[PDB]
Amino acid sequence: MYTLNWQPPYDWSWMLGFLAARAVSSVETVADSYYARSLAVGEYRGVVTAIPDIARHTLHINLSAGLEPVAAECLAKMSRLFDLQCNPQIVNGALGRLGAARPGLRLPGCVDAFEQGVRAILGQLVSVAMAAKLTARVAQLYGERLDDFPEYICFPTPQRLAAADPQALKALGMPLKRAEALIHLANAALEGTLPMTIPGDVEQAMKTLQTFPGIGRWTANYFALRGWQAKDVFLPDDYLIKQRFPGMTPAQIRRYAERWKPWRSYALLHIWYTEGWQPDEA
Amino acid sequence: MYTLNWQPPYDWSWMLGFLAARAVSSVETVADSYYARSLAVGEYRGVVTAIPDIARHTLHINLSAGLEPVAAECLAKMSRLFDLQCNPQIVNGALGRLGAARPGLRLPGCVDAFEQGVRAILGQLVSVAMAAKLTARVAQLYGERLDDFPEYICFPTPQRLAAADPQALKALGMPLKRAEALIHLANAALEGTLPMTIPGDVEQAMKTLQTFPGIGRWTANYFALRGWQAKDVFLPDDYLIKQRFPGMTPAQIRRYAERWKPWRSYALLHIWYTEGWQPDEA
Amino acid sequence: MYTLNWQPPYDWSWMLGFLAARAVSSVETVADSYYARSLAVGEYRGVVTAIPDIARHTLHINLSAGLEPVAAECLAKMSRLFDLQCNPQIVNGALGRLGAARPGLRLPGCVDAFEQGVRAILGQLVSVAMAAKLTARVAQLYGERLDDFPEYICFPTPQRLAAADPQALKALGMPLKRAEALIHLANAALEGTLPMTIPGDVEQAMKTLQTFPGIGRWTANYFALRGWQAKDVFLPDDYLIKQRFPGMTPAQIRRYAERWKPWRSYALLHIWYTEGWQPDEA
Amino acid sequence: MYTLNWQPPYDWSWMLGFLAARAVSSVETVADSYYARSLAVGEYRGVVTAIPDIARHTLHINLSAGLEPVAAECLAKMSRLFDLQCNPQIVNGALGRLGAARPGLRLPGCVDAFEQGVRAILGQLVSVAMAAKLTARVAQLYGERLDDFPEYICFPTPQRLAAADPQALKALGMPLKRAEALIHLANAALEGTLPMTIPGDVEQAMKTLQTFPGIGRWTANYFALRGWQAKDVFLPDDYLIKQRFPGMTPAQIRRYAERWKPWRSYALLHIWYTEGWQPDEA
DNA sequence: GACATGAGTGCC
DNA sequence: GGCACTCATGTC
DNA sequence: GACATGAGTGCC
DNA sequence: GGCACTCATGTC
């Protein structure tokens, strides 16, 4: 129905694959030709279905009737998720070699900063698949089902999680500390203390974000990258990243990563997805 | 040339009129058949043109090339400005008689919360036409002019007003306290402390805004109403509102206004634009 | 055994009467010729007996063997409780008539600031008789018993009340808010946040006390007078004071009291203890 | 005139030796047979003289006429400075061989915590002798000279040192951060933020003190030890203490000192004054 | 991965 | 001897 | 209109 | 009494 453009190239298989690995049961549905999920914008609810059209370098978006009143916001959330703004020529011509292998690489964003904040926290320590597992159990117990689409369920809202028993969340398979971190976040979201859109001084905001209980530098960085689509942040503390920069310390990986400014987020993504990458033999 | 839907009725004449009186020179251009303005989204900039289609209950939006990359967010911004999500038969079915004369009334939003905050501040005590001219001088001194469209100029940014000399701003025609309110607000915007979207707990947020230097209850209420498009806030501290409820104190006005919950913001717009309105013997 | 002198005249009948009405069962014993109570200074504990010898305008202090290693401290605490430093000629001189019916009037201090802090809070609203009873219940539940004096009990320490159960104190006959006030005061004392000695800036210090939950302006003023023995503070908010200045508001009474500077604490006492008194309708 | 008791043994040579080395000209006089200094308690001023009487295990205190009204507090101030409360059998019973060589060792305290705070700060990174002269300069420049004893100057009040020009202090011979630290400490004293008496939770109160400018973990410790006479604190960050524990790191010394709880302050003093001392090679 | 604790390494 | 900026530990 | 004071009112 | 809320009132 609705239609948005993008600038070639765009590696849709890479993106869909990336979302699929983290997809949450009952919330999202990922296939090789499309993406679909529940979506809440205020008291408006429905299902969004994104269908890319390669030959035409366009993305078709369909909305169930309940989301029509806020169509444009849905579109906006979709374009942030898919990084439709990216000019690959600018980024690739900057990252050089590092990106030459997957020039269609895009930054997977989010459809809602609060959700991403919940995802990031639950992604602490565990495996990607284990976080999706955990996130799935949290959505199941605290999310709302769509009257029109029972197979689907909306991600738990800020109020619902703000009013959850720490013990209950703990029972889903996470420390008490993690559950407290989640509740705190829902409140920050209710009060407007969790920036929902990318802030002008990402560095400063990430510092404030770290004063949140349960949110360390990794979570704040990862949340900035995904939740805000901050394009120039690296994850020198990441598990896989330490495994790509053998024997290097956080401030080293960090100083190194500086050569990719101001597209460190994209460089980070390429490294994660470059099977045998290793720092330059310099 | 995009397109967005709206439900009838929609009083465009009234809306464009409300925007026209507050139109800021070089930033916005208002006519009886279209609205247009400079628009910045991150580092992307251009000019938006909104043409209403009464024939097909549609709103045609056109963007210059420099904004096309972030097209979706632009459409979202225009939909919040024009209140396209509104179901008038629901609001008026609730407001009753108060809304029967102007059922097409809509809540004039903003295209960016930061800008709206600045306008709210530069609108204190002075006249509407004055705030407009005053605000234009600020946009004149701190705005980013568009290369693609020299005639237009982007609204100041938080980083540009945060680094502004108090005295300089004051010399444009405002007390020093107000120049300082603008500087503080820009800072808050920079670090993510200023909610850019409607928060879950609208008054907890408004209470927090009242700690900001230069922001009292009237400014908070007004900011929430237009900046967040909060649908259930009333302005019992408003000059004109006090005149509409002869000899009534803020609390009495607020008590009375409860009859229009959960659509007090619409009630407010109807009462503001209904000369000679007066409360019942209730 | 030990002896401390004073400057005549000293109204011991008034001093003992005042202390006698506020005495806490098992903690203090007040008779016509002597005062005695439990006393803890660190881990040193015992009983203190003070016998005033009018003839030789001296004060005889006896100390249980347990307090002997900290004799001086006990002596200084007795001198602060009895305002032995007072020069009646200077106060009665700077006060004129107001302080002529009882020039022996002394400011009753305290033996420990935290204790006075607790008394001040528990002395809120209820009558003096109820405050003493209420306080007696608190001492009875959290106090320390003296092995050599089974009849006496040490006033509760900050370490016990800080650990106290809010509900336990509430059960003694006080609002939950007042018990929480006590718990917080005890935590402040443990942390070194409660000034145990008169600060140089009493006004600033009191303003800081008022940020303590359960502590308003009255409690802070009363605590300064008794707890720090600050000599220049008035209780414009006091109940009995309001009756002493009919028709006048806290600020009027306060403007009036400026005439007795810098001995307002004393004036406050005289006016307090003069049923007939009334202001000069200037 | 006045007499205070102490339990033997008491190494007076050592004590007077410790105070004489740190004596401030115009403030205190220290001789073989006595100790003397200016003293201010409110608006009462004068000279205090302490003379130990070894024959009867007592200390004689003489107060100049100006301090009689507050004699008891003066007596208490002397008891805290000379650690009269100490029971050497308990301490020495616990310390074992560590204090067998000097069973009369006492903890040199102070007569005022503010003053002690200033001395702690002025003695940072300098020699005992320099600190004394440095301090003396400060005293002379901001003190209150006694009319009855011309050569005696009262130590600078908090009010006087708060309003001191941050440069005049630099002049005397201290860094810029050094003088700001003094001016800060002084305001705290005025507002009641600097505990004047030992808090129930020393570790906590010390943490808070460390948030003070110019006050680090070393000064906070030394301050607790002398200004509050806390008996169980150690100084692993002390230069001399480092030399006494060859190699070992701050945390290791600390863990070793634990063997002397709850008298680490005494353990500390013994180690300071036992030259070829070295830990057990165990 | 979050978080409080702990070793160090130059400049005031 | 304060004080800011890293890494190494060691439960949860 | 933001914002100190000040004084009322009513519910802990 | 504490305290949050409410209604002048005077200033910038």
3-state secondary structure A27-52: CEEECCCCEEEEEEECCEEEEEEEEE
DSSP-derived secondary structure letter, C258: G
Mutate: best of D48, D155, D190, partner C, most C CBs <10 A: D190
Q: Does residue D208 sit at the C interface (CB-CB below 8 Å)?
A: yes
The two tokens of residue B75 are 């459409």
CA dist., res. A187 & res. A160, Å (int): 10
Question: Out of D72, D193, D200, whose CB is closest to C189?
Answer: D200
Question: Which residues on chain A are in Cβ contact (under 8 Å) with B69?
Answer: 7, 84-85, 87
C1' of H9 to CA of B23 (Å)? 36
Q: Tell me the residue length of chain A.
A: 282
Strand ranges for C136-186 from DSSP E: 144-146, 149-154
Protein contacts of strand G with Cβ less than 7 Å away: B 124-125, 181, 210, 213-220, 237, 239; C 175, 177, 249-252
Question: Which residues on chain C are in Cβ contact (under 8 Å) with D70?
Answer: 79, 85
| Contact criterion met (CB < 8 Å) for C72 and D72 | yes
With beta carbons less than 8 A apart as the criterion, state whether A60 and A5 touch: no
The two tokens of residue A173 are 């398979």
Q: Which conformational region is residue A62 in: left (phi greater than 0), alpha (psi within -120 to 50 degrees), or beta? A: beta
Domain with CATH 3.30.310.20 in chain A: 1-112
Question: Out of A72, A191, A199, whose CB is closest to B190?
Answer: A199
CA dist., res. D39 & res. D59, Å (int): 18
Task: Residue C86: name the closest of C105, C101, C99 by CA.
Answer: C105
CA dist., res. A255 & res. A162, Å (int): 39
Which residues of A does the annotation mark as catalytic?
A: 238
Q: Which residue is nearest to nucleotide E8 (CA to C1')?
A: D249
Dihedral, CA of residue D143, residue D145, residue D151 and residue D154, to nearest 10: -50
Mutate: best of A3, A75, A210, partner B, most B CBs <10 A: A75
Strand H lies under 7 A from the Cβ of residue C9: no
The resolution of the experimental structure, rounded to one decimal in Å, is 2.4
Strand H contacts in C 72-101 (CB under 7 A): none
Mutate: best of D79, D91, D161, D231, partner C, most C CBs <10 A: D79
Q: Does residue C126 sit at the D interface (CB-CB below 8 Å)?
A: no
Domain with CATH 1.10.1670.10 in chain A: 231-282
C1' of G6 to CA of B282 (Å)? 32
CA dist., res. B183 & res. C192, Å (int): 38
Q: Does residue B86 sit at the A interface (CB-CB below 8 Å)?
A: yes
CA geometry: angle at A253 spanning A252 and A258, to 5°? 95
Interface chains of chain B (3 or more CB pairs under 8 Å): A
- CATH architecture entry for A113-230: Orthogonal Bundle (1.10)
Which structural technique was applied? X-ray
| Contact criterion met (CB < 8 Å) for B75 and A72 | yes
With beta carbons less than 8 A apart as the criterion, state whether D85 and C69 touch: yes
CA dist., res. B40 & res. B112, Å (int): 9
C1' of E12 to CA of D128 (Å)? 20
- CA–CA distances in Å: residue B19 to residues A131, B128, B226: 47, 11, 12
Helix-helix angle D217-227:D202-210, to 10 degrees: 130
Q: Does residue C4 sit at the D interface (CB-CB below 8 Å)?
A: yes
Phi, psi of B37 (to 5 degrees): -165, 160
Instruction: Give Cα A221 distance to the centre of its chain.
Output: 12
Interface chains of chain A (3 or more CB pairs under 8 Å): B
C1' of E5 to CA of C169 (Å)? 37
Residues facing residue A181 across a β-bridge:
none
Q: Does residue D51 sit at the C interface (CB-CB below 8 Å)?
A: no
With beta carbons less than 8 A apart as the criterion, state whether D263 and D94 touch: yes
The burial of B146, by beta-carbon neighbours within 10 Å (0-12 exposed, 13-18 middle, 19 or more buried), is given as: buried
Question: Out of B84, B190, B199, whose CB is closest to A200?
Answer: B190
Task: Residue B230: name the closest of B110, B99, B89, B96 by CA.
Answer: B110
Q: Which conformational region is residue A202 in: left (phi greater than 0), alpha (psi within -120 to 50 degrees), or beta? A: alpha
Domain with CATH 1.10.340.30 in chain C: 113-230
Q: Which residue is nearest to nucleotide F6 (CA to C1')?
A: A251
Amino acid at B228: W
> Which of 3.30.420.40, 3.30.310.20, 3.10.580.10, 3.40.50.720 is the CATH number of B1-112?
3.30.310.20
CA dist., res. C256 & res. C282, Å (int): 10
CA dist., res. B152 & res. B29, Å (int): 9
> Which of 3.50.30.30, 1.20.1630.10, 1.10.10.10, 1.10.1670.10 is the CATH number of B231-282?
1.10.1670.10
Strand E lies under 7 A from the Cβ of residue A218: yes
The bases of strand H with some atom under 7 A from any protein CB are 1-3, 5-8, 12
With beta carbons less than 8 A apart as the criterion, state whether B1 and B74 touch: no
CA dist., res. B99 & res. B93, Å (int): 9
| Contact criterion met (CB < 8 Å) for A5 and B198 | no
- Where do the H-state alpha helices sit in chain B? 12-22, 71-81, 88-95, 97-100, 113-121, 128-142, 158-162, 166-170, 176-191, 202-209, 217-222, 239-244, 250-257, 264-272
Instruction: Give Cα D22 distance to the centre of its chain.
Output: 9
Q: Count the Cβ atoms, other than its own, within 10 Å of residue D123.
A: 18
Phi, psi of A203 (to 5 degrees): -60, -45
Contacts of C59-66 with C-beta under 8 Å, sequence gap 24+, read C59/C3, C59/C4, C59/C5, C59/C6, C59/C84, C60/C1, C60/C2, C60/C3, C61/C1, C61/C2, C61/C3, C61/C4, C62/C1, C62/C2, C63/C1, C63/C2, C64/C146, C64/C148, C64/C149, C65/C148, C66/C146, C66/C148
CA dist., res. A199 & res. C177, Å (int): 40
Question: Which residues on chain B are in Cβ contact (under 8 Å) with A87?
Answer: 69
Instruction: Give SS3 for A97.
Output: helix
CA dist., res. C146 & res. C152, Å (int): 6
The two tokens of residue D187 are 């305001």
Residues facing residue C29 across a β-bridge:
C36
C1' of E7 to CA of D187 (Å)? 34
Strand F contacts in D 163-182 (CB under 7 A): 177, 181
Per-residue three-class SS string for chain D: CEEEECCCCCCHHHHHHHHHHCCCCCCEEECCCCEEEEEEECCEEEEEEEEEECCCCEEEEEECHHHHHHHHHHHHHHHHHCCCCCCHHHHHHHHHHHHCCCCCCCCCCCCCHHHHHHHHHHCCCCCHHHHHHHHHHHHHHHCEECCCCCCCEECCCHHHHHCCCCCHHHHHHCCHHHHHHHHHHHHHHHHCCCCCCCCCCHHHHHHHHHCCCCCCHHHHHHHHHHHCCCCCCCCCCCHHHHHHCCCCCHHHHHHHHHHHCCCHHHHHHHHHCCCCCCCCCC
Instruction: Give SS3 for B86.
Output: coil
* Chain C residue closest in CA terms to D69: C85
Question: Within 13 A of A133's CA, how many CA atoms are on the CB side?
Answer: 9
* Chains B and A make contact, 3+ CB pairs within 8 Å: yes
